[PDB]
């Protein structure tokens, strides 16, 4: 389980692993990147992580309060003011998932009226807001890929640019740690658009991703053969 | 706390860093590789990570058993016939250190005795351990998930002893930026193959030239790579 998020100045951008530690033994597949969407009004994406049962608990009641009543009886993703607000739902989503008996998530999207904004969730409820600073958010095995993010990261960064940088932050991942795995679901998100055509699963045989990592894999083995070593 | 060590043909490697926590709130540097030696016949370097109350027992009851002498059926680091008998020394310290009294010890233990090649092991909080191959020439112990991925890409067995240093010192580059648990100095010792000695051995400071000018070539290296790489646009 591996998944990252960027807010940028043109928009946000999304990706998350689909390998899972759904049974005791066996392992399964399982897409964590949720969608939700208004076509003009908002828009919102959901990466998820941790344990499966609650995770899918948590989309679950999402999507149950929504469709239950037309009358609007509590705060839901639609019905909410702004991206703070919406963060609360999801938030409060948590919190209902416990009450009734680790799962970390980062929440993002936008609303008609101000920017596109991105969260991330904690398992007791609460959470934060991403700034200029830190312009990301990783859950689950998160480790492996942040040397890369933290090097190259920038909030100035265009959306194409940060897909690079985020894709190779899985590809350092799946290297050494086995619970992450392909395939990868990256959605891409420009600003003011209110709709998300921008999206793609990436698949073991995709090819842009096989030259990604032996392209990448080239230039550390090239670099590295040049490192001097007669100063120890 | 982060420590890497590999086995060659060449020899063995170990590297460091200095950074632990005393207290919940204190932070200072403690040396975690210590080593034993006896000119000639035999040498031990041991990294230590995890608590460091339950790090400096181990090494203090080593310690210990070496300095008796007297009356003594126990098998110490300098009676033991082979390195395999020499890990689970120091796996019977471990275990010993859990009697006499949260606990979470990990250990890197590797060197050479006269009549066998160098070998290198990693001990386990409970006693047990196991040894590097060729397949894993090296073994990390503290904050290991950062510097993971750099050896992954590059490590062979039969990598040159200063070859595998550099590597392991990118591996401490990639942890000391994105985490600050692991910290700076790092101390590194160089054992060629059947000399019996450590006569290679060098702290590196944070006011250090060889390693800011091989961080810096480094992230220069990976924002020109990162440059030249396709577009991703779907």
């Given at each position: 389980?591996?998944?990252?998020?960027?807010?940028?100045?043109?928009?946000?951008?999304?990706?998350?692993?689909?390998r899972?530690?759904?049974?005791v033994?066996?392992?399964?597949?399982?897409?964590?990147?949720?969608?939700?969407?208004?076509?003009?009004?908002?828009?919102?994406?959901?990466?998820?992580?941790?344990?499966?049962?609650?995770?899918?608990?948590?989309?679950?009641?999402?999507?149950?309060?929504?469709?239950?009543?037309?009358?609007?009886?509590?705060?839901?993703?639609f019905?909410?003011?702004?991206?703070?607000?919406?963060?609360?739902?999801?938030?409060?989503?948590?919190?209902?998932?416990?009450?009734?008996?680790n799962?970390?998530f980062?929440?993002?999207?936008?609303?008609?009226?101000?920017?596109?904004?991105?969260?991330?969730?904690?398992?007791?409820?609460?959470?934060?807001?991403?700034?200029?600073d830190?312009?990301?958010?990783?859950?689950?095995?998160?480790?492996?890929?942040?040397?890369?993010?933290?090097?190259?990261?920038?909030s100035?960064?265009?959306?194409?640019?940060?897909?690079?940088?985020?894709?190779?932050?899985?590809?350092?991942?799946?290297?050494?740690?086995?619970?992450?795995?392909?395939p990868?679901?990256?959605?891409?998100?420009?600003?003011?658009?209110?709709?998300?055509?921008?999206?793609?699963?990436?698949?073991?045989?995709?090819?842009?991703?096989?030259?990604?990592?032996?392209?990448?894999?080239?230039?550390?083995?090239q670099?590295?053969?040049?490192?001097?070593?007669?100063?120890?």
């Amino acid at each position: 389980t591996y998944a990252v998020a960027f807010r940028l100045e043109r928009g946000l951008v999304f990706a998350a692993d689909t390998r899972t530690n759904a049974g005791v033994d066996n392992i399964a597949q399982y897409k964590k990147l949720q969608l939700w969407r208004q076509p003009g009004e908002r828009v919102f994406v959901l990466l998820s992580a941790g344990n499966l049962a609650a995770t899918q608990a948590v989309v679950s009641l999402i999507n149950e309060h929504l469709s239950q009543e037309t009358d609007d009886e509590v705060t839901t993703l639609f019905t909410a003011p702004n991206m703070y607000r919406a963060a609360r739902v999801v938030g409060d989503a948590v919190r209902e998932a416990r009450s009734i008996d680790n799962t970390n998530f980062i929440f993002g999207g936008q609303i008609k009226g101000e920017r596109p904004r991105l969260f991330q969730i904690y398992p007791e409820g609460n959470f934060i807001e991403a700034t200029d600073d830190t312009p990301f958010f990783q859950i689950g095995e998160h480790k492996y890929g942040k040397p890369i993010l933290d090097r190259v990261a920038r909030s100035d960064m265009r959306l194409g640019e940060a897909a690079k940088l985020m894709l190779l932050s899985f590809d350092s991942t799946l290297r050494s740690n086995l619970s992450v795995g392909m395939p990868i679901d990256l959605v891409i998100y420009e600003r003011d658009t209110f709709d998300v055509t921008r999206e793609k699963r990436i698949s073991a045989d995709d090819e842009y991703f096989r030259n990604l990592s032996n392209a990448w894999s080239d230039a550390l083995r090239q670099a590295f053969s040049k490192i001097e070593e007669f100063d120890v």
